[PDB]
Coordinates of C-alpha atoms and ligand atoms in Angstrom, one line a residue:
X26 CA -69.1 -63.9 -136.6
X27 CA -70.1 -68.1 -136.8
X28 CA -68.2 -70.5 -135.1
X29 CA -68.3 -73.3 -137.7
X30 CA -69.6 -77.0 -136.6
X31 CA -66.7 -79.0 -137.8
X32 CA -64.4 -77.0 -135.1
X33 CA -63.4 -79.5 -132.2
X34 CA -65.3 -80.1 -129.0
X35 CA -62.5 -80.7 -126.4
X36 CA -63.9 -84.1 -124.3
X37 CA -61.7 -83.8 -121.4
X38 CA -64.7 -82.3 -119.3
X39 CA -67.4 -84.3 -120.7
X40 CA -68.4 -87.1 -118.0
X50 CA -65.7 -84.7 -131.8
X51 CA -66.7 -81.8 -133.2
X52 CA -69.8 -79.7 -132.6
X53 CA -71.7 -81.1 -135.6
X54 CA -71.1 -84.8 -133.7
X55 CA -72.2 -83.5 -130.3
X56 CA -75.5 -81.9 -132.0
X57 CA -76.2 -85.3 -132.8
X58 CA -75.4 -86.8 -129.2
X59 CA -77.6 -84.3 -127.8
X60 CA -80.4 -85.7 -129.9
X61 CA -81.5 -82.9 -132.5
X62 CA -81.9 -83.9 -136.3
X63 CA -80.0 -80.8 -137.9
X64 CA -81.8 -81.2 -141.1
X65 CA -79.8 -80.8 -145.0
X66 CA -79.6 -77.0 -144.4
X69 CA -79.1 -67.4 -139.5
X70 CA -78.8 -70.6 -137.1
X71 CA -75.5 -72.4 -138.6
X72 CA -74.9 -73.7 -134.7
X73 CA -76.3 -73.9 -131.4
X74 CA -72.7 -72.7 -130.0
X75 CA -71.4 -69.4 -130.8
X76 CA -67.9 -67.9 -130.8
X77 CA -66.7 -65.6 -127.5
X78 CA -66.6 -62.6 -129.1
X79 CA -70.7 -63.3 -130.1
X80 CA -71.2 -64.6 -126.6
X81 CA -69.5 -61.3 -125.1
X82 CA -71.9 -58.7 -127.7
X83 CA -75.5 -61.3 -126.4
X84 CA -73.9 -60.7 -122.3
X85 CA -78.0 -59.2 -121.7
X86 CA -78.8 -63.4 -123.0
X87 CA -76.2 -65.2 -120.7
X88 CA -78.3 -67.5 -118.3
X89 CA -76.2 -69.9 -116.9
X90 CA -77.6 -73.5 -116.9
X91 CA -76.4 -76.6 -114.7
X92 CA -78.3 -80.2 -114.6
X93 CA -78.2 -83.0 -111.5
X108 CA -82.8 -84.7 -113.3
X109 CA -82.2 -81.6 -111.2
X110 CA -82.4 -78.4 -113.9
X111 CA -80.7 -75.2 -112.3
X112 CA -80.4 -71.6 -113.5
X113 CA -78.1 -68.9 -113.0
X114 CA -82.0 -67.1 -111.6
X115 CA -81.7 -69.3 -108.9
X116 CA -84.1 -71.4 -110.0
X117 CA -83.8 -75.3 -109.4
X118 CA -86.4 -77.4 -110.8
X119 CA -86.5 -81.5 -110.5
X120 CA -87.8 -83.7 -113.7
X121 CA -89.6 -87.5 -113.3
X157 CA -90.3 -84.3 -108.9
X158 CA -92.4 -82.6 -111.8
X159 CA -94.0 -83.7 -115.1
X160 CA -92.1 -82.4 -118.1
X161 CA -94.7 -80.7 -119.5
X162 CA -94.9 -78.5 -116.5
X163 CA -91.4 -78.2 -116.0
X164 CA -90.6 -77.0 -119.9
X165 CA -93.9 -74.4 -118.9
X166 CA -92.1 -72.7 -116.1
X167 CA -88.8 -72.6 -118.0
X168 CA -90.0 -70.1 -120.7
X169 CA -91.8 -68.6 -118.1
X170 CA -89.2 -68.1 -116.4
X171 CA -86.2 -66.8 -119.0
X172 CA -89.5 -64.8 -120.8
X173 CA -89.7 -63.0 -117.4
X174 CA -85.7 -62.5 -116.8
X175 CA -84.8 -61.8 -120.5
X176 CA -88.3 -59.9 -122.1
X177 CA -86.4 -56.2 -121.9
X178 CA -82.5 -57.2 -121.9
X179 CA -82.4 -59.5 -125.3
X180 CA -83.7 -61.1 -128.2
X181 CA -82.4 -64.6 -127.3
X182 CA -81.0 -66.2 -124.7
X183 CA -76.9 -67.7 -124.6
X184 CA -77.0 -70.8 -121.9
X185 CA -73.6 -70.2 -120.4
X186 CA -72.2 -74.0 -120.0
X187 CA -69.9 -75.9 -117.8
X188 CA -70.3 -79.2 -119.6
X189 CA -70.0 -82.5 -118.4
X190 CA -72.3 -83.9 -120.8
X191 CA -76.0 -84.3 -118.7
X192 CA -77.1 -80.7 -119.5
X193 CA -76.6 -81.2 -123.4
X194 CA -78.6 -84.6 -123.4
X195 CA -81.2 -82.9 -121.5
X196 CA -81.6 -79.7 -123.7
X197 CA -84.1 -81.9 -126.0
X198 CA -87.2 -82.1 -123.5
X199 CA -87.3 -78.3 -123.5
X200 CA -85.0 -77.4 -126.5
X201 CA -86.4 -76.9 -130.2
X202 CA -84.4 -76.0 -133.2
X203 CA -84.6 -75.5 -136.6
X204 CA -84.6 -71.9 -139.0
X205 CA -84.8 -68.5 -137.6
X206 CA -88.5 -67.1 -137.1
X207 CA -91.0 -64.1 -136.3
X208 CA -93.1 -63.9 -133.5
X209 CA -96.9 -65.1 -134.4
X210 CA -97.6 -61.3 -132.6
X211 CA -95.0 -59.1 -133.6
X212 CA -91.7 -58.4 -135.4
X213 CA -89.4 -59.7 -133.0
X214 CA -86.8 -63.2 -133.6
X215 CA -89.1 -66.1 -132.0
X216 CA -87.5 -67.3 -128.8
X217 CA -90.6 -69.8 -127.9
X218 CA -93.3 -72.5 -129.4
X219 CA -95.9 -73.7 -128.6
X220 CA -97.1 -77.4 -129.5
X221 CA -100.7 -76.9 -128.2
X222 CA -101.1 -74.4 -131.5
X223 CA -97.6 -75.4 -133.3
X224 CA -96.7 -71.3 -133.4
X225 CA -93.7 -69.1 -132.8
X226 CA -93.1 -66.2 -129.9
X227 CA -90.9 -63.8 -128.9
X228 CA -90.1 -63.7 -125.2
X229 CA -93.0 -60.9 -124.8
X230 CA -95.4 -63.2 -126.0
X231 CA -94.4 -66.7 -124.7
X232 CA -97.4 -66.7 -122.3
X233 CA -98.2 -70.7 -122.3
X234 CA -95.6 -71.3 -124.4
X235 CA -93.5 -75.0 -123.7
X236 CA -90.3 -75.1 -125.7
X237 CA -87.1 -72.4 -126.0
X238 CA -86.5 -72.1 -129.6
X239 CA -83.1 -71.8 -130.8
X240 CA -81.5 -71.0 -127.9
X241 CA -77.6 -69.9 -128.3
X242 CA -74.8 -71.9 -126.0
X243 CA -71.1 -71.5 -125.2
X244 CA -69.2 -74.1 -123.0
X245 CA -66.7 -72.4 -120.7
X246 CA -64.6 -75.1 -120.4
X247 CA -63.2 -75.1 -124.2
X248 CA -62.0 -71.0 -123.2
X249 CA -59.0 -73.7 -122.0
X250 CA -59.3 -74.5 -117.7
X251 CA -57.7 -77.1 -115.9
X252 CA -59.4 -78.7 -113.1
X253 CA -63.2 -78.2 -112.0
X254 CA -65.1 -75.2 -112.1
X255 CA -65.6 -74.8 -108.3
X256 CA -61.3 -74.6 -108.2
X257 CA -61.7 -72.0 -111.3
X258 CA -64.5 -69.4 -110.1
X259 CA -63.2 -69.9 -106.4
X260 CA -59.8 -68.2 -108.1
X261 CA -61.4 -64.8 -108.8
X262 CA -64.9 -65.0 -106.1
X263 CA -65.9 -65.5 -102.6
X264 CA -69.8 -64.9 -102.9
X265 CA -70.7 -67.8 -104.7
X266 CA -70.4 -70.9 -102.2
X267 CA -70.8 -74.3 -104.2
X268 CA -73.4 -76.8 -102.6
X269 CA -74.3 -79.6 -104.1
X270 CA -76.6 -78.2 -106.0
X271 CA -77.6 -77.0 -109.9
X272 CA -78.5 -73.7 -109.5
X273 CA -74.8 -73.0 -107.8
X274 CA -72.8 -74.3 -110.8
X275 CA -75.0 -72.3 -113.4
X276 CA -74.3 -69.1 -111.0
X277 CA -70.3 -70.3 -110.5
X278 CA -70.2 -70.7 -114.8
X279 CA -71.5 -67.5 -115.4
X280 CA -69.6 -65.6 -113.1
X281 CA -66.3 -66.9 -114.2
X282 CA -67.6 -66.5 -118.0
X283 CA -67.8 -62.7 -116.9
X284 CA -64.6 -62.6 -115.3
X285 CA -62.9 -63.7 -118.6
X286 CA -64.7 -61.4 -120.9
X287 CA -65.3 -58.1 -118.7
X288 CA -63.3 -58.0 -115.8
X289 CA -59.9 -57.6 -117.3
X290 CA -60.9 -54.4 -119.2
X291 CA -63.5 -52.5 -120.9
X292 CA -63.7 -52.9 -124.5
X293 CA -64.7 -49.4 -126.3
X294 CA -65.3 -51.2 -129.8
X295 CA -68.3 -53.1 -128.3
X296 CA -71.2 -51.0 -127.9
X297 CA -74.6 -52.4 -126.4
X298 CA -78.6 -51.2 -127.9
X299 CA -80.4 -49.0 -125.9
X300 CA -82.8 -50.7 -123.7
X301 CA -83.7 -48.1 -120.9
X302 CA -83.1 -44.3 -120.2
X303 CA -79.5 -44.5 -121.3
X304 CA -79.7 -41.2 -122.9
X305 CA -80.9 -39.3 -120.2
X306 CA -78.7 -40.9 -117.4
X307 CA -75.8 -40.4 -119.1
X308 CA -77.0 -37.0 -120.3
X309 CA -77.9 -36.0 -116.7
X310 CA -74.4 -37.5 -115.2
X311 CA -72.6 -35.5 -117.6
X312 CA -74.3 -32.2 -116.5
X313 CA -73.3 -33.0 -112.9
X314 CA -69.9 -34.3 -114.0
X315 CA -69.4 -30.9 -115.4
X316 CA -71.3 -28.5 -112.5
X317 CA -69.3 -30.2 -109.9
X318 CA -65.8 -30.5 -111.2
X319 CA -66.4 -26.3 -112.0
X320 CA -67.1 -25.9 -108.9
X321 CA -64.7 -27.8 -107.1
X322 CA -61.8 -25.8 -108.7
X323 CA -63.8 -22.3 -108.4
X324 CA -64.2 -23.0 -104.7
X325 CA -60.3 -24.2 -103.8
X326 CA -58.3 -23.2 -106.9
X327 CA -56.2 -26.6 -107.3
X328 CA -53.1 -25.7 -109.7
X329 CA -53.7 -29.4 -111.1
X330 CA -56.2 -32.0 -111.9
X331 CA -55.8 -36.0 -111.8
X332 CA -58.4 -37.4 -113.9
X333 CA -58.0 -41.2 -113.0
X334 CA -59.9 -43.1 -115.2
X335 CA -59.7 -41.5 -118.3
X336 CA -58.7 -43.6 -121.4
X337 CA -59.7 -40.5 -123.9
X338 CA -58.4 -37.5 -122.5
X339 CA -61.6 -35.9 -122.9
X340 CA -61.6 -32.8 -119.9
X341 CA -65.6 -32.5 -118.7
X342 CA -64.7 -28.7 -118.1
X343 CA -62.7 -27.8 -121.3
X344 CA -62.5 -24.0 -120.3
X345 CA -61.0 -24.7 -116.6
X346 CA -57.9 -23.0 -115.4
X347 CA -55.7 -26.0 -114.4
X348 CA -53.0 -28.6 -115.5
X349 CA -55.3 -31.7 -116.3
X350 CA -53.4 -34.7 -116.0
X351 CA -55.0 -37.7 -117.4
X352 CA -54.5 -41.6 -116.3
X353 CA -55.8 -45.1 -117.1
X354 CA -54.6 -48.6 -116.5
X355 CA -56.0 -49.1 -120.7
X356 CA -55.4 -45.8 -122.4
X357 CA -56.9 -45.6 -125.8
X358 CA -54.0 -45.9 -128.1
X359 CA -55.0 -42.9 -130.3
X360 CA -54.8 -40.9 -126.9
X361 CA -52.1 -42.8 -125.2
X362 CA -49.5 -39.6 -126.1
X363 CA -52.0 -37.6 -123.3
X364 CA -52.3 -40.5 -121.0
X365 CA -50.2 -41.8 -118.1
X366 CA -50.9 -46.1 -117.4
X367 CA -51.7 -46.5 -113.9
X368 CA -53.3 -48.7 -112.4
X369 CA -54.5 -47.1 -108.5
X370 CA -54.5 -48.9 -106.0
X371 CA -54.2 -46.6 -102.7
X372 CA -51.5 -49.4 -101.2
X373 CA -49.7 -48.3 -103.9
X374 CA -50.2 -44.7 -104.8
X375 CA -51.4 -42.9 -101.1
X376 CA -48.5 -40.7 -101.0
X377 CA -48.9 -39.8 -105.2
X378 CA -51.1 -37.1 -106.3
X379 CA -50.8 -34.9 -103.2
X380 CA -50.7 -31.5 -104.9
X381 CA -54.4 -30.4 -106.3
X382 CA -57.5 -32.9 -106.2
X383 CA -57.9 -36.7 -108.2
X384 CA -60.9 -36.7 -110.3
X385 CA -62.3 -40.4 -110.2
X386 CA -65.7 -40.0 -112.8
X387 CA -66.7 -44.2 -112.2
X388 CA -63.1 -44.9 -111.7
X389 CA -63.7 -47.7 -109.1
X390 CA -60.5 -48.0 -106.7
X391 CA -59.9 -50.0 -103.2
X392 CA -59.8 -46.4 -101.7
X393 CA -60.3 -43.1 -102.5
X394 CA -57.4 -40.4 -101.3
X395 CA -58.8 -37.2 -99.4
X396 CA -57.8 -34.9 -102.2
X397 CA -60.6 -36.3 -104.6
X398 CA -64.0 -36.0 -106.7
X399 CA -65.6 -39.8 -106.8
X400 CA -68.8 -40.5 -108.7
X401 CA -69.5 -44.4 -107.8
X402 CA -72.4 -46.3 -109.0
X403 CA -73.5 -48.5 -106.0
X404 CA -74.1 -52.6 -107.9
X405 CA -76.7 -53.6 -105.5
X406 CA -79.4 -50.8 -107.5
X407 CA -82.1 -53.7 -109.6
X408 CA -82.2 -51.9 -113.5
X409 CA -82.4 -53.7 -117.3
X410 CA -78.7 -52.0 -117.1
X411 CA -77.0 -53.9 -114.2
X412 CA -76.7 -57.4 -114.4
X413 CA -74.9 -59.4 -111.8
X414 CA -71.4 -60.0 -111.9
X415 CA -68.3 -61.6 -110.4
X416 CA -67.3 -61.5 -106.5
X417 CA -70.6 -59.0 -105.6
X418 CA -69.6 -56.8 -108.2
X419 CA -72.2 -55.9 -111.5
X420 CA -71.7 -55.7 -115.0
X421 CA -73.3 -52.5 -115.8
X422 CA -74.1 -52.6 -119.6
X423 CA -75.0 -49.0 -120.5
X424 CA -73.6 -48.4 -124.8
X425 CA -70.4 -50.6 -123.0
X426 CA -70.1 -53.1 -120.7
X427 CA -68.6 -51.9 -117.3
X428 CA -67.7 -54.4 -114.5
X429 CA -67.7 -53.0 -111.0
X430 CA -66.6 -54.1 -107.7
X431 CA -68.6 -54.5 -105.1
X432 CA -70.2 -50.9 -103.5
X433 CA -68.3 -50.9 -100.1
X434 CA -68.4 -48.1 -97.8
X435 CA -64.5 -48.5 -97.0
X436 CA -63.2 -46.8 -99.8
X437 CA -65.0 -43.6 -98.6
X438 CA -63.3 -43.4 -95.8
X439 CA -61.5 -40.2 -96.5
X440 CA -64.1 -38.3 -98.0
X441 CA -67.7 -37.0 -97.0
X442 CA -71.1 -37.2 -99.1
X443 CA -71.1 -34.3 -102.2
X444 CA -74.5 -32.2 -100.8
X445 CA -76.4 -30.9 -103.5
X446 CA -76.1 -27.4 -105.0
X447 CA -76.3 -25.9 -108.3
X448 CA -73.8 -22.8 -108.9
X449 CA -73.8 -20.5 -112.2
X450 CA -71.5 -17.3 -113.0
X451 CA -73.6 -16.6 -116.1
X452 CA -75.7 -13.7 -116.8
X453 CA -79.0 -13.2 -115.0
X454 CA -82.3 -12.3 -117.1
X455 CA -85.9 -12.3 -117.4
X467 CA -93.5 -19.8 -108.6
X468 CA -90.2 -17.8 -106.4
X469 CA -86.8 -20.5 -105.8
X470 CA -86.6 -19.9 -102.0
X471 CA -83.5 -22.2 -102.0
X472 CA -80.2 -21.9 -99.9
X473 CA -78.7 -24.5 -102.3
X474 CA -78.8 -22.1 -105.5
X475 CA -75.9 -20.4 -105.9
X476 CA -76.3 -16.9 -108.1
X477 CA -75.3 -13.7 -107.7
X478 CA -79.8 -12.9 -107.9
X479 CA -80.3 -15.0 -104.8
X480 CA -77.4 -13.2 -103.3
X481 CA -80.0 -10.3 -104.2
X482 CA -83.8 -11.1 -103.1
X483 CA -85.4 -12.7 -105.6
X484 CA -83.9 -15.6 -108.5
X485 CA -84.5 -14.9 -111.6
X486 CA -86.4 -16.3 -114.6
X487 CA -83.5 -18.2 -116.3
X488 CA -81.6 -19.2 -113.0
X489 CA -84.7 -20.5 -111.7
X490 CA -85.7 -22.5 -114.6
X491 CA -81.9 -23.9 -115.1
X492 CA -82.0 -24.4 -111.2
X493 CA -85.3 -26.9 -111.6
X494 CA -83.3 -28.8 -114.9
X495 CA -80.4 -29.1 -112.8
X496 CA -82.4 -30.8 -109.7
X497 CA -84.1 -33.4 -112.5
X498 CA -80.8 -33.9 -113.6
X499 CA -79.0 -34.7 -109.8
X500 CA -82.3 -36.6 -109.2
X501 CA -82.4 -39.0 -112.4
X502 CA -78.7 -39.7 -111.9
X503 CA -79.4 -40.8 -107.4
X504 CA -82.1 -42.7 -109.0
X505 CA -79.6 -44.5 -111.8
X506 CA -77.8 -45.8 -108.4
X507 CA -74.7 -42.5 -108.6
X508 CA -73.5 -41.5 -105.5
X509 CA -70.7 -38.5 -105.2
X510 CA -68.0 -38.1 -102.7
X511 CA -65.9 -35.0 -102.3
X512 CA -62.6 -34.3 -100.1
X513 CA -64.0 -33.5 -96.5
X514 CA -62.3 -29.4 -97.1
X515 CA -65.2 -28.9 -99.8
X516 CA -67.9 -26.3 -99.0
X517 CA -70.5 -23.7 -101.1
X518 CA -69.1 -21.4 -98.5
X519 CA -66.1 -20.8 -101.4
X520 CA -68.4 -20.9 -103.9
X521 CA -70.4 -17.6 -102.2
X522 CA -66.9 -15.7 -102.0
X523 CA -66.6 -15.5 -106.1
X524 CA -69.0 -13.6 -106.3
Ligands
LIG1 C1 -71.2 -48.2 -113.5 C2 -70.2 -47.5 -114.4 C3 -70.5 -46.4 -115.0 C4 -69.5 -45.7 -115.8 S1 -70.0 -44.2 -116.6 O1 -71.3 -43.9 -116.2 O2 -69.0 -43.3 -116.4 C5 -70.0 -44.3 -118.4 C6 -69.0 -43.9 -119.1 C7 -69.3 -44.1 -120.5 C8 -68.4 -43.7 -121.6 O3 -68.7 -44.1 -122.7 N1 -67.2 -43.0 -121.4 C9 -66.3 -42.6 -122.4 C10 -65.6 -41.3 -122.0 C11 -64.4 -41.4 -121.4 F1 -63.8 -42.6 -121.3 C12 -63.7 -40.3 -120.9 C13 -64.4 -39.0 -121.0 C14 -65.6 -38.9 -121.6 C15 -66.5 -37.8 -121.9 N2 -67.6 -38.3 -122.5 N3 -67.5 -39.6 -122.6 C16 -68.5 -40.4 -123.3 C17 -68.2 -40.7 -124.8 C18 -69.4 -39.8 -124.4 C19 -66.3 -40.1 -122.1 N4 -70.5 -44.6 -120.5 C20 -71.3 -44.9 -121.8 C21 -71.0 -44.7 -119.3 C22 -72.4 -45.3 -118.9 C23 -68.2 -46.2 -115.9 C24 -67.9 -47.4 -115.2 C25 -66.7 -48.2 -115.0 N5 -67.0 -49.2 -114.2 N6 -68.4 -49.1 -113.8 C26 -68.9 -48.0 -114.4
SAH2 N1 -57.6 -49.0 -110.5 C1 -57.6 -48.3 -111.6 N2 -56.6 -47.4 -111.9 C2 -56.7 -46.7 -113.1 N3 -57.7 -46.8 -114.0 C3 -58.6 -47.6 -113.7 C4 -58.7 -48.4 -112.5 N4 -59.8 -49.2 -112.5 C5 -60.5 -48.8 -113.7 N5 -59.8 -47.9 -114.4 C6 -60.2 -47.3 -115.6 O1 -61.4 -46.6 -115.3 C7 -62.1 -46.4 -116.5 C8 -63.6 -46.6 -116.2 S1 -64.7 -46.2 -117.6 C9 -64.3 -44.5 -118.0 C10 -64.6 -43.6 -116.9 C11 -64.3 -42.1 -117.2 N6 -63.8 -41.5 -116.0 C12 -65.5 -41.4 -117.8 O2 -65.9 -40.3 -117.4 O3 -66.1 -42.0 -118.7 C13 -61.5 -47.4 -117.6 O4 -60.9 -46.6 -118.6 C14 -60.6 -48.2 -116.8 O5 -59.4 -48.7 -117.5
CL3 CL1 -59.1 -52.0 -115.6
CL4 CL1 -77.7 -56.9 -109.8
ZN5 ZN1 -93.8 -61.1 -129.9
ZN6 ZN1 -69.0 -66.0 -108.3
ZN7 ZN1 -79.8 -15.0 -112.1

């Protein structure tokens, strides 16, 4: 959980143990929830919604982008726009913030002319842990409530550097990132330190015993992606009958259409060890695996490859959508932290190349019973008759709020360029 002060500080980066570098940095730690200013990786990775990277040279930059110049601006203002600023980026992600360092020792000594510590506190306004005070009326706010507020309270820290680097960062990010070009300036190192902090702890894999609060519509996005997951999977074996199923992607062996009428064949490049008996490792790369998989269709449910094969069922989240859920990530991919923490490349438009956009429908084979549905895109044997009715109708309008919230959660589907509701028609 802690990561006890008398652990060693490795100095090699600076330009010791944590207990002596609390002192450098000019806090009096008084004789007794707040053991350290610096927390372990694994309590870094579960605050990832906190992580604001923070670079000084005074020239004070932030992973936001932000670069602001101390005495130039008075200090007073400067500490002003800081909580405004972390209030505004971290109000609906986290209770706190984590400042992910690269240190060479001037960010630390500067932390004490916006920094105050001491024991864990309420807001003066509501429940919430006190990120913020004021010493215009010596009280305590959350990041909701900050408004005028001129000093972080109890901020969290890691420094990247004691994860064990040689070299600088620039040589370190530029390893696993092209986006991020370093100037000479503070803003670009808190960016470049974050980033690479995110590569270590997210890009490798996705860790299923780490689960995140709800912050947003979680629920119904996933809810509503499910119930398309399951809709166009149905009808995408319905329409063409493939003998077999690749699910690529899938660490649980969980099918999304358990009743189907195929082999399903499950792969992941991390199966879950309680499942690994159903589960091929694979990691697919179409350089690699083009001329695999040729018999039936690949199922790729937020399985995000180089390229997509022609025989396959992609839903892709596109990282450039703005959400509470999607922060930014490594080489213009996100980290999309929805119950887990998911890092995705990059949205490019290459990997598509064999497929076509999925056009909306909604089919059902159930029983009919019972505003008309004039729509060409339902699919039931009653608008194969006149008129829809009562139940298709209504399970037509859920399905459309469904497709809808999921566009609007930044999901895009992609089907092999053969697939048509033309098929879909015939079985009835
Ligand atoms: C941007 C983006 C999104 C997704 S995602 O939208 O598919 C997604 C997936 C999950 C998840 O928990 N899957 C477990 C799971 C599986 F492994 C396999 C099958 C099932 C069936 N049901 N379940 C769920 C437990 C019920 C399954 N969650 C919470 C989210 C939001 C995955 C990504 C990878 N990179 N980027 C990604
Ligand atoms: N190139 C690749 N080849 C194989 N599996 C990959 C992969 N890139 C990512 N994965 C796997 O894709 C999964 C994404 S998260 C789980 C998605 C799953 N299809 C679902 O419906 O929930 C992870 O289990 C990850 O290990
Ligand atoms: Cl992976
Ligand atoms: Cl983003
Ligand atoms: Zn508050
Ligand atoms: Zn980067
Ligand atoms: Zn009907």
């Amino acid at each position: 959980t802690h990561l006890s002060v008398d652990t060693k500080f490795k100095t090699e980066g600076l330009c010791m143990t944590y207990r002596r570098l609390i002192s450098m940095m000019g806090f009096k730690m008084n004789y007794q929830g707040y053991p350290n200013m610096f927390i372990t990786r694994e309590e870094a990775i579960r605050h990832v919604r906190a992580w604001i990277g923070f670079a000084v040279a005074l020239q004070l930059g932030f992973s936001t982008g932000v670069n602001l110049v101390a005495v130039g601006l008075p200090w007073n203002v400067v500490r002003i726009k800081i909580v405004q600023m972390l209030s505004d980026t971290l109000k609906n992600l986290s209770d706190r913030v984590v400042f992910v360092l690269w240190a060479h020792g001037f960010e630390l000594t500067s932390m004490k002319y916006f920094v105050k510590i001491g024991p864990e506190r309420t807001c003066c306004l509501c429940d919430r842990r006190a990120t913020c005070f004021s010493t215009a009326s010596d009280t305590y706010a959350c990041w909701h409530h900050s408004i005028g507020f001129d000093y972080v309270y109890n901020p969290f820290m890691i420094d990247v550097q004691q994860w064990g680097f040689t070299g600088n960062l620039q040589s370190n990010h530029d390893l696993y990132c092209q986006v991020h070009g370093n100037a000479h300036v503070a803003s670009c190192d808190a960016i470049m330190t974050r980033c690479l902090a995110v590569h270590e702890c997210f890009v490798k894999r996705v860790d299923w015993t780490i689960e995140y609060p709800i912050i947003g519509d979680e629920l119904k996005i996933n809810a509503a992606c499910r119930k398309v997951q399951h809709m166009v999977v149905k009808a995408a074996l319905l329409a063409d009958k493939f003998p077999v199923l690749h699910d690529i992607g899938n660490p649980k062996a969980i099918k999304c259409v358990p009743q189907a009428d195929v082999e399903w064949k499950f792969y992941d490049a991390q199966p879950c060890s309680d499942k690994a008996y159903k589960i091929e490792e694979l990691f697919y790369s179409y350089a690699t695996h083009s001329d695999k998989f040729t018999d039936g269709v690949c199922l790729f449910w937020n399985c995000n490859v180089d390229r997509y094969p022609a025989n396959s069922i992609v839903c892709r989240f596109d990282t450039r959508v703005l959400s509470n859920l999607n922060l930014p990530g490594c080489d213009g991919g996100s980290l999309y932290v929805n119950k887990h923490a998911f890092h995705t490349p990059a949205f490019d438009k290459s990997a598509f190349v064999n497929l076509k956009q999925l056009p909306f429908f909604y089919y059902s084979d159930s029983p009919c019973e019972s505003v008309p549905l004039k729509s060409a895109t339902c699919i039931t044997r009653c608008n194969l008759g006149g008129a829809v009715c009562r139940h298709h109708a209504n399970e037509y309008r859920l399905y459309l709020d469904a497709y809808n919230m999921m566009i609007s959660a930044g999901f895009s589907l992609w089907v092999y360029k053969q697939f048509d509701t033309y098929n879909l028609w015939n079985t009835f």
